[PDB]
Design a protein around this ligand. Structure first.
Ligand SMILES: CO[C@H]1/C(F)=C/C[C@H](C)[C@@H](C)S(=O)(=O)NC(=O)c2ccc3c(c2)N(C[C@@H]2CCO[C@H]21)C[C@@]1(CCCc2cc(Cl)ccc21)CO3
Ligand SMILES: OC[C@H]1O[C@H](O[C@H]2[C@H](O)[C@@H](O)[C@@H](O)O[C@@H]2CO)[C@H](O)[C@@H](O)[C@@H]1O
Length: 518
């Protein structure tokens, strides 16, 4: 389906101030005659890239900025071009969170960081360390309470602990990300997750605790502490708990490091209402009165709009939010963040339930988080050396032995496939009629149709990549060598998205090397 002209459909998460956002929508309707529909579907961050890919979905999508680079890389977002006068009304660091490949891909709304929320009637002074929580829980259990309950199903809430002693997602040094350097299974990450698993094993927490269970327990006065963001404060106000919002506890003397999000509004590339969306976001929502309406429903945190943020800055809950934000780090918006989050969510859940050990769980998470970059490194090098006749001299980098050995295996087995299946390869090449970067882009659909319509095994993966090499050779001979790298990226995208779970179960490219050994 096509997006309907002359209305606005907005998607925002169900924990945010969506009735507040609908009031801003009604003000827009009152001026313009244009109906604004606000929806909060489950798993909207997973649904958006599926429906938007077919030219469907909402006109405007709200999420934290971490998902938006993936969306932008897939052509799902309109470039945002506010004038200088509008850009200067928001803090520059919030604009930086919505910049992807030099282009603004969303409007920033507000800065979110988790804090420790504590019941002052149970815990007059909250604990400064994670390490004192077991003893504190023992004290509280004797009075029929617990120390701490928070969502263990979403790794956002457990990440601050994992990150504290040296866990990291993608390493940041000299003002740039080393996407090859992933810190999911180092000693720091292990120490943090082991502490969490030990809290569970000693019955200080329950592995099944989710968002709803922890909220209800805190807001009924059953647990002394929770971990949550500004959005949660509204329901706590209603409960009349005497609560404080403060700095997260330290682990091994070091601050808990929450991943900081910037709630952001992106415009769908398929929307025929882009001018209405920009008008709504700039002149209705991102105003003192627009942000107030949302903030009164569920608090936004530290708003991007300089004028309204000065008014809210005096709130000690916001001061505490920004203290934790400064100790933490701004999330990347790189396309791999979705894979990172999927990998760590599974690792926390399996470690918490005892399905896997901490070592086993973080091992798998590391492989999952590394999979795109390692797969690209191998696939791009094979395609490029096959096309040119000469290999890449560049160092292989992180997990370089695996990448080197996988490439050597792929040269052996892939050249065998190209030789033996030369007839079919030639026939399919002629059938596809590839001649430019436009035709290369259209291969993704046929590639995913043929590669996924069949069993999952290493032999079929070799075919995917070897035919890729066969096409790369053709692109070089027709003076279309600049298409080879986008082809490699497209093959890699198809492989890692469709076979993510299977690939991780095989120990990634080490499984490939082992399967075809001797
Ligand atoms: C019958 O004719 C096919 C052929 F010869 C199969 C022989 C093989 C060795 C089988 C015995 S198998 O079961 O081991 N493997 C597969 O069946 C298989 C797996 C993946 C795969 C394909 C097959 N493709 C169809 C092949 C290529 C040559 O003839 C087709 C190519 C494919 C789709 C077209 C566009 C395209 C573009 C790029 Cl850049 C890369 C790949 C592709 C998707 O990838
Ligand atoms: O749990 C992984 C998850 O973390 C972040 O999602 C947060 C979001 O930023 C908050 O606004 C709030 O809604 O809670 C969410 C956690 O349930 C990432 O933004 C998201 O991409 C990621 O999957």
């Amino acid at each position: 389906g096509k997006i309907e002209e002359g209305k606005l459909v907005i998607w925002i998460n169900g924990d945010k101030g969506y009735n507040g956002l609908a009031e801003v929508g009604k003000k827009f309707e009152k001026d313009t005659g244009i109906k604004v529909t606000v929806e909060h579907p489950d798993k909207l961050e997973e649904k958006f890239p599926q429906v938007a890919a077919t030219g469907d979905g909402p006109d405007i999508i709200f999420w934290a900025h971490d998902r938006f680079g993936g969306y932008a890389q897939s052509g799902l977002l309109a470039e945002i071009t506010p004038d200088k006068a509008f850009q200067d009304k928001l803090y520059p660091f919030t604009w930086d969170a919505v910049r992807y490949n030099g282009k603004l891909i969303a409007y920033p709304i507000a800065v979110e960081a988790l804090s420790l929320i504590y019941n002052k009637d149970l815990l007059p002074n909250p604990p400064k360390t994670w390490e004192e929580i077991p003893a504190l829980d023992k004290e509280l259990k004797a009075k029929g309470k617990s120390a701490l309950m928070f969502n263990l199903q979403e790794p956002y809430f457990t990440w601050p602990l994992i990150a504290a002693d040296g866990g990291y997602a993608f390493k940041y040094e000299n003002g740039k990300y080393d996407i090859k350097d992933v810190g999911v299974d180092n000693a720091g990450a292990k120490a943090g997750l082991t502490f969490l698993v030990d809290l569970i094993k000693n019955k200080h927490m329950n592995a099944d605790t989710d968002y709803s269970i922890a909220e209800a327990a805190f807001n009924k006065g059953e647990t002394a502490m929770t971990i949550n963001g500004p959005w949660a404060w509204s329901n706590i106000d209603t409960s009349k708990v005497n609560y404080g919002v403060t700095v997260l506890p330290t682990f091994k003397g070091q601050p808990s490091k929450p991943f900081v999000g910037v709630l952001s509004a992106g415009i769908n590339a398929a929307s025929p209402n882009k001018e209405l969306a920009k008008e709504f976001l700039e002149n209705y929502l991102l105003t003192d009165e627009g942000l107030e309406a949302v903030n009164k429903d569920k608090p936004l945190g530290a708003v991007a709009l300089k004028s309204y943020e000065e008014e809210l800055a005096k709130d000690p809950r916001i001061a505490a939010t920004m203290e934790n934000a400064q100790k933490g780090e701004i999330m990347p918006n790189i396309p791999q963040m979705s894979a990172f989050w999927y990998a760590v969510r599974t690792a926390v859940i399996n470690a918490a339930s005892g399905r896997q050990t901490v070592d086993e769980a973080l091992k798998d998470a590391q492989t999952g988080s590394e999979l795109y970059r390692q797969s690209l490194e191998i696939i791009s090098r094979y395609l490029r050396e096959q096309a040119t006749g000469a290999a890449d001299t560049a160092p292989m980098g992180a997990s370089g032995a695996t990448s080197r050995k996988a490439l050597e295996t792929l040269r052996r087995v892939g050249d065998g496939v190209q030789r033996n299946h030369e007839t079919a390869f030639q026939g399919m090449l002629r059938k596809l009629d590839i001649k430019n970067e436009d035709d290369v882009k259209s291969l993704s659909r046929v590639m995913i149709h043929v590669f996924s319509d069949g069993v999952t095994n290493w032999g079929r993966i070799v075919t995917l990549i070897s035919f890729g090499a066969f096409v790369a050779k053709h692109l070089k001979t027709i003076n279309q060598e600049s298409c080879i790298e986008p082809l490699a990226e497209s093959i890699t995208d198809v492989l890692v998205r469709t076979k993510r779970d299977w690939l991780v179960k095989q120990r990634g490219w080490d499984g490939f090397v082992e399967f075809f050994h001797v």
